[PDB]
Amino acid sequence: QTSVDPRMMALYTDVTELVGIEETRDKLINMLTEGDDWSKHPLKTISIVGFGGLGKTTLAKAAYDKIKVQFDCGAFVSVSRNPEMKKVLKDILYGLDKVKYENIHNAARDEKYLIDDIIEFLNDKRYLIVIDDIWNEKAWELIKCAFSKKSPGSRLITTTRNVSVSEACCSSEDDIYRMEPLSNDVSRTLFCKRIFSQEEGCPQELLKVSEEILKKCGGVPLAIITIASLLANKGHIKAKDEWYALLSSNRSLEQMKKILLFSYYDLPSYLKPCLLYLSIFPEDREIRRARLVWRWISEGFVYSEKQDISLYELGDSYFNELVNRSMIQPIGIDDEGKVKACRVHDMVLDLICSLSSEENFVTILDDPRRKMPNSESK
Amino acid sequence: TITLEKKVRKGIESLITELKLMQAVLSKVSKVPADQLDEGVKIWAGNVKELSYQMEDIVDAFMVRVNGKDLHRISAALEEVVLQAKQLAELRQRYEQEMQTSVDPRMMALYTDVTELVGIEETRDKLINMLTEGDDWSKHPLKTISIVGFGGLGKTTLAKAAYDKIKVQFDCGAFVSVSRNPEMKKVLKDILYGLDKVKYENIHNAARDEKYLIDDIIEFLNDKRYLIVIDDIWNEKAWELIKCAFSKKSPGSRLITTTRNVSVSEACCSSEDDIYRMEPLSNDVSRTLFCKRIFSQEEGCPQELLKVSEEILKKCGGVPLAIITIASLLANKGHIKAKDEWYALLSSNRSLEQMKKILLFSYYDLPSYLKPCLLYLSIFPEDREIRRARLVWRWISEGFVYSEKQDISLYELGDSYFNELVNRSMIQPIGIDDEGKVKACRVHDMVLDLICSLSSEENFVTILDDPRRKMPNSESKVRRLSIQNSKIDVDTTRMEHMRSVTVFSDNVVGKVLDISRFKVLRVLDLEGCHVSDVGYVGNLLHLRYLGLKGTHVKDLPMEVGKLQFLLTLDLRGTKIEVLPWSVVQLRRLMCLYVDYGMKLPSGIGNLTFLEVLDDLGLSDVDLDFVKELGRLTKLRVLRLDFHGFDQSMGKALEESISNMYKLDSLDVFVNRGLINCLSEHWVPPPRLCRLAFPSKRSWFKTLPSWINPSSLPLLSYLDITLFEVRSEDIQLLGTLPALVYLEIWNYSVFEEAHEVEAPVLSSGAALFPCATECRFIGIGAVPSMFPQGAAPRLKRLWFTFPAKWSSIGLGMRHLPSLQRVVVDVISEGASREEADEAEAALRAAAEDHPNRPILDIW
Ligand SMILES: Nc1ncnc2c1ncn2[C@@H]1O[C@H](COP(=O)(O)OP(=O)(O)OP(=O)(O)O)[C@@H](O)[C@H]1O
Ligand SMILES: Nc1ncnc2c1ncn2[C@@H]1O[C@H](COP(=O)(O)OP(=O)(O)OP(=O)(O)O)[C@@H](O)[C@H]1O
């Protein structure tokens, strides 16, 4: 049969296991209400952006559960990558009132009548609605119709991985919240709590390997949690040399890989090679963009049939699109007014290296790891 | 050599069958919108198209040229093309692996805010008045209104506005939309659910046939007033079925329908007064919409942008969809773009994709045999207008028009194709031809861009402009070429397989390119160019259309007799005087345009199949010529000149004319004097439909006797100048059944010194059925002409009135439909004091009429 989205179980995680939410939760809550007469201003929309595994839907869920009391009706809907609009509208309706629209998932009407139902139900009410995991523009363009009328005091929240989608949702660029990774102390406490759960005392021999591992994670809660479960080995903590072996180099790991690969399976077909090409450069350094663009043009990944196009600006567009989908961190400003360099997360780099190795796209030569392929003549 | 002949025949028959199959497949493919095809099928279809072109060329070569060398070349080409076909088949089979739906883009527009519509109030109130129209509207029978126009014009918006405004004064209503390929069950369920959301709340899950749903609708509407809107009807069967639910009679109920097709609207409404034709916005309204959309708050356009703004607004054409999309494109909500960027856009995103997808519905709906005929319009320049006869003859020459019936003329098929294109609101017709049909046509500019892109993606047509649209980067096989900017230079050494060349340049460099190398041509069109002489027209052997109009050609090579296939030969405005004799030997020839100053050779009787002959000389000609004229039997248009023609032999000419059974139009031009032909006891052809004598200085005597409505049952046009008109001559014209148009001159009033005599009509009613215009130039009377109310369709009247008759009444209430009157007064007999008296009198007589026509005294 078909499997279920691995991100669904995370909605049933206990609340006493979240480390550093209070600050961000209260900041978002203040961004929503913001005043004493917030219940008299026009409808507002907030959006949250970042890369996968950063903790967006967790924060939205926290704020929603905290302040849902001060409204009349609300819902918490999730849109996937390839959505069916009927399903989304039925989900909204069933979330607004479980009794009246109890059998709404069996009705067979088109989108116009479902939108009319949503409009009629929301007349003269304050509502708080969260829409999750939007992946492109058409979906929002259609769902926006149900919130066309004006309603003083109502609020919308959306979460996404794509930046242009967030610019299209919100009106002002002050209504965008950018998720950012945890600090070092918070990450360390999460780690300890996750593994040394009760002692919360790290032995000394493990300190420096712990620090290098935490640096490799980068403050992303998903990676921290998965590696902590890997090293926990609930029966027994592993040995120091085994920690070293892991650093140099299961269900949770498969889940993390499957989750991160959503952004790769979503790219247009002409952008997949341009991404794998990043597995040529070493780990932590940064890459000049001009080098990348000229090498892409030389390899033959950039072409068009129009008569009046310059390949340089096509390549630049490809680079900006890769940055747009939150798969690359830009750094600095070039001497011609553009980005200077780019960085890549380390787990993403490992995924890319494995993907590109499974197809003879690139062969790397390190002595400890990644030696010559055993049986390959080409 | 006997064996070779037998083999080539077999190969050709095989190719013909294969061509049929390939065309079936391609037509099947070309229906799917581009978003549902996969790349494999698309690539394979392109290659199949190319092979089809090659095989057509081989078949044509065999048909024309049939010796040893020819048969050898043909056998070689046959073998090669068969091999290529097999190879492509294997290639497709090698990489075949088997391994949601979007929403209508027009749906979001129903949720647009109402404060963003600019100029609705007037049209909205006009439609509302067309619906109610009175105080007792709630007691008249059921009425149906329809709205027509092209896409993006604002039909459903207007319907929605009126509906929301007046829905209160009814009991029940609904707003349903039918798509292109509808399911009738879904439409009926939609109506039911719209009428009552509570009772029929779960109606979309019921599973009954159409009969029971129709019965439910009929039972619910019993004893109620309802207002129902039905949207986006695309053909006739849908309405034919939905009409059954509104079969009973219900006083006070109303229906509205909106559509893009004209025949559908004629089938919905009863009277042609219940049709609303949407028309684009004016210039001021369009400009305010533009500004509002972009400069939203300032509403102040900077000066440097004024003229580019005006050119852009002219290109949009007043269609709200285009205005809105281009305004969003130039807005760039972050920042208004720069002036040079505006220029770049003018010379040359989500909203743009949506607009293209919306406009392409009318293209994906055409029958398969009409899609090429539309793409062919991408050959002509942007804003000019196109003659329809040119189009029709070029379509026939290219091979787009064919049928298997035995008794059909391709000219009327082509005319039907043109009228169908006009019917679907994809072409704007302009003017009236000299044979009673449309003259020219225009195309919207965005539609033109869409057509150009579509036709370019398939090597259908290659255009040559220097700034944009240069030679294709990697293309060795070009079939149809269109030269518009003579600045470019052409290679024309790889273009072996041309089919059609057209030059639009007044420029000298236009005549520079060599033509004798295109050994396979079908259409040569040099109309307007300044070429001087063409001796290479022979040795082409494949032509079908030779268009030389308005060129400086002095004389033709006496080798045109070799072109055994030549449908059209157009010589007008050239400097030719005598046609070469070998012209007689063009057995397949269907159209001959020529000036009356050119000498035709003798044996013209051999040119059977002639369907159109223009401006015969008829001067310095013997009798056997006028007798030969009687052999062209299937001839539908004729024009004569009678210039030097001796009027002693008119009887033979009239017999030869009476011999042509199929015939529609006829002209006779005579300089002066009395016309000494077409005597009485003539028996005109039965199907005649248009007759004209544009002389205006050569009169008939009293009237031809053969004008009785039995001999000419069909007639919709007439133009005669009589010597002296009687009173019981207009009577005979009243007897004529159709007679849409009419124009009579009285020769004695002007050239002689006779005076205007008042004609009186008597003994009858309904004298002029279907007479929309009448110009009695030389004779006039308003009341006594039309007693009891006759000609209840007239719209323009021309008559003369002496000032003597100031002391007959000018009451214009006999005639309801009057809209325009043109008068001229003769003031020498009566004094000025009677003159201004009569002027004010007829002015008041025009003012009392409810329609309030316009006057002109002259
Ligand atoms: N502050 C935190 N403390 C502990 N765990 C956290 C915290 N924030 C997030 N997590 C954990 O991170 C995991 C993934 O987070 P989440 O799925 O909310 O990120 P996301 O932005 O929704 O990812 P995606 O963009 O793929 O939907 C969850 O299992 C959650 O338990
Ligand atoms: N008077 C107006 N002012 C502003 N916008 C208008 C006006 N009329 C129409 N529009 C806009 O034009 C767009 C298309 O109009 P509409 O779809 O009603 O035309 P239509 O005749 O229904 O087209 P189709 O024949 O394809 O259904 C709509 O988005 C509407 O907002």
Give the count of beta carbons closer than 10 Å to the beta carbon of residue A342: 20
Any idea which residue has 């190319």 for tokens? B50
How many Cα atoms within 13 Å fall on the side-chain side of residue B182? 24
Length of chain B: 858
Which residues of chain B does A85 touch, with a Cβ-Cβ cutoff of 8 Å? Answer: 103
CA angle A282, A285, A288 (to 5 degrees): 100
For B269-295, give one letter per residue: b (16+ CB within 10 A) or e.
beeeeeebeeebbeeebbbebbbebbb
Amino acid in position B766: A
Any idea which residue has 């949720």 for tokens? B111
Contact B654, B682 (CB under 8 A): yes
Q: Which two tokens stand for residue B121?
A: 């109030």
B93-101 CB contacts, 8 Å cutoff, 24+ apart: B95/B40, B96/B40, B100/A82, B100/A83, B100/A84
B269 in the Ramachandran plot: left (φ > 0), alpha (ψ -120 to 50) or beta? beta
Whose alpha carbon is nearest atom 16 of ligand 1?
A55
| Cα distance from N-terminal residue to C-terminal residue, chain A | 39
Contact B234, B365 (CB under 8 A): yes
Sign of CA dihedral B698, B701, B707, B711: negative
Which residues of chain A does B110 touch, with a Cβ-Cβ cutoff of 8 Å? Answer: 112
Integer CA distances (angstroms), B585 to B591, B599, B602, B737, B841, in order = 14, 16, 11, 43, 67
- The widest CA-to-CA distance across chain A, in whole angstroms, is 73
Domain with CATH 1.10.10.10 in chain A: 260-365
Helix (H) or strand (E) holding B61: helix B39-65
Cross-chain residue pair B108–A145, CB shorter than 8 Å: yes
Strands ordered across the beta sheet of B386-387: B386-387, B438-442, B428-432
φ and ψ of B802, to 5 deg: -70, 145
Cross-chain residue pair A141–B205, CB shorter than 8 Å: no
How close is the Cα of B225 to the center of ligand 2, in Å?
29
- The widest CA-to-CA distance across chain B, in whole angstroms, is 99
Residue B500's SS3 state is strand
Q: Which of A79, A93, A136, A145 to mutate to test the interface with B (most CBs of B within 10 A)?
A: A145
Ligand 1 pocket test, pick from A13, A26, A54 with the greatest ligand atom count within 8 Å of Cβ, gives A54
Residue A131's SS3 state is strand
Any idea which residue has 């002259």 for tokens? B858
- Which of A157, A178, A149, A174 minimizes the C-alpha distance to A67? A157
Contact A18, A131 (CB under 8 A): no
Q: Which of B35, B38, B100 to mutate to test the interface with A (most CBs of A within 10 A)?
A: B100
Fold of the domain spanning B359-464: Arc Repressor Mutant, subunit A (1.10.10)
Ligand 1 pocket test, pick from A11, A188, A222 with the greatest ligand atom count within 8 Å of Cβ, gives A222
Give the count of beta carbons closer than 10 Å to the beta carbon of residue B441: 20
CA angle A233, A212, A339 (to 5 degrees): 125
Q: Which ligand is nearest to the CA of A190?
A: 1
Contact B473, A307 (CB under 8 A): yes
B798's CB contacts (< 8 A; 6+ apart) are: B774, B775, B776, B777, B821, B822, B823
B282's CB contacts (< 8 A; 6+ apart) are: B119, B318
Residue B441's SS3 state is strand
Rg (CA), chain A: 24
Give the count of beta carbons closer than 10 Å to the beta carbon of residue A79: 23
CA angle A304, A305, A310 (to 5 degrees): 55
Question: Using N-to-C axis directions, what is the helix angle for B350-359 and B445-456, rounded to 10°?
Answer: 90
B residues 397-436 closer than 8 Å to A (CB): none
DSSP A166-232: HHHH-SSTTSEEE-----HHHHHHHHHHHHSTTT----GGGHHHHHHHHHHH-S-HHHHHHHHHHHH
For domain B108-277, the CATH architecture is 3-Layer(aba) Sandwich (3.40)
Which residues of chain B does A169 touch, with a Cβ-Cβ cutoff of 8 Å? Answer: none
The minimal CB distance from B103 to the residues A106, A109, A142 is found for A142
Any idea which residue has 């039909």 for tokens? B155
Amino acid in position B580: P
CATH of domain A9-178: 3.40.50.300
Residue B359's SS3 state is helix
Amino acid in position B638: L
A349 has binding-site annotation: no
B523's CB contacts (< 8 A; 6+ apart) are: B394, B397, B398, B499, B500, B501, B502, B543, B544, B545, B547
Integer Cα distance of B798 and B776 in angstroms: 6
B667's CB contacts (< 8 A; 6+ apart) are: B638, B639, B640, B692, B693, B694
A57's CB contacts (< 8 A; 6+ apart) are: A7, A10, A11, A78, A132, A133, A159
A residues 84-143 closer than 8 Å to B (CB): 84-85, 106-109, 111-113, 115, 137-138, 141-142
φ and ψ of A307, to 5 deg: -90, -20
| DSSP β-bridge partners for residue B826 | B802
The minimum CA-CA distance between A272 and chain B, rounded to whole Å, is: 18
Q: Which two tokens stand for residue B671?
A: 């300089």
Which residues of chain A does B204 touch, with a Cβ-Cβ cutoff of 8 Å? Answer: 107-109
Any idea which residue has 């110009």 for tokens? B775
φ and ψ of B829, to 5 deg: -65, -45
Amino acid in position A194: R
Which residues of chain B does A84 touch, with a Cβ-Cβ cutoff of 8 Å? Answer: 100
B383-386 CB contacts, 8 Å cutoff, 24+ apart: B383/B445, B385/B430, B385/B440, B385/B441, B385/B442, B386/B440, B386/B441, B386/B442
Helix (H) or strand (E) holding B230: strand B226-233
Contact B752, B773 (CB under 8 A): no
B211 DSSP 8-state letter: H
Integer CA distances (angstroms), B555 to B532, B535, B575, in order = 9, 9, 8
Give the count of beta carbons closer than 10 Å to the beta carbon of residue A208: 11
Any idea which residue has 């917030």 for tokens? A38
A4's CB contacts (< 8 A; 6+ apart) are: none
The reply to whether B202 touches chain A by the CB within 8 Å rule is yes
Amino acid in position B744: I
Integer Cα distance of B124 and B161 in angstroms: 7
Contact A180, A23 (CB under 8 A): no
| Cα distance from N-terminal residue to C-terminal residue, chain B | 82
Integer Cα distance of B267 and B239 in angstroms: 9
Contact B364, B31 (CB under 8 A): yes
How many cross-chain Cβ pairs, A to B, lie less than 8 Å apart?
Answer: 31
Q: Which two tokens stand for residue B667?
A: 């002209």
Contact B376, B399 (CB under 8 A): no
> Experimental method used, please?
cryo-EM
How close is the Cα of A30 to the center of ligand 1, in Å?
21
Q: Which two tokens stand for residue B261?
A: 């097709």
B771's CB contacts (< 8 A; 6+ apart) are: B739, B740, B742, B791, B793, B794
B399 has binding-site annotation: no
Integer Cα distance of B815 and B790 in angstroms: 7
Contact B773, B794 (CB under 8 A): yes
Q: Which two tokens stand for residue B536?
A: 């290479």
Report how far Cα B297 is from the mean position of its chain's Cα atoms: 43
Integer CA distances (angstroms), B785 to A17, B58, B702, B722, B814, in order = 102, 68, 20, 19, 10
Burial label for A321, CB within 10 Å (0-12, 13-18, 19+), is middle
Q: Which two tokens stand for residue B302?
A: 């900077």
How close is the Cα of A111 to the center of ligand 2, in Å?
20
A57 has binding-site annotation: yes
- Which of B609, B654, B697, B639 minimizes the C-alpha distance to B434? B639
Strands ordered across the beta sheet of A155-160: A73-78, A127-134, A155-160, A44-49, A176-178
Q: Which ligand is nearest to the CA of A132?
A: 1
Fold of the domain spanning A260-365: Arc Repressor Mutant, subunit A (1.10.10)
How many Cα atoms within 13 Å fall on the side-chain side of residue B664? 11
Q: What is the resolution of this structure in A?
A: 3.0
B318 has binding-site annotation: no
Contact A128, A153 (CB under 8 A): no
Q: Is A186 in the pocket of ligand 1 (CB under 6 A)?
A: no
Which ligand 2 atom sits nearest the alpha carbon of residue B150?
25
Length of chain A: 378
Helix (H) or strand (E) holding B549: strand B545-549
Q: Which two tokens stand for residue B385?
A: 């207008």
Amino acid in position B406: Q
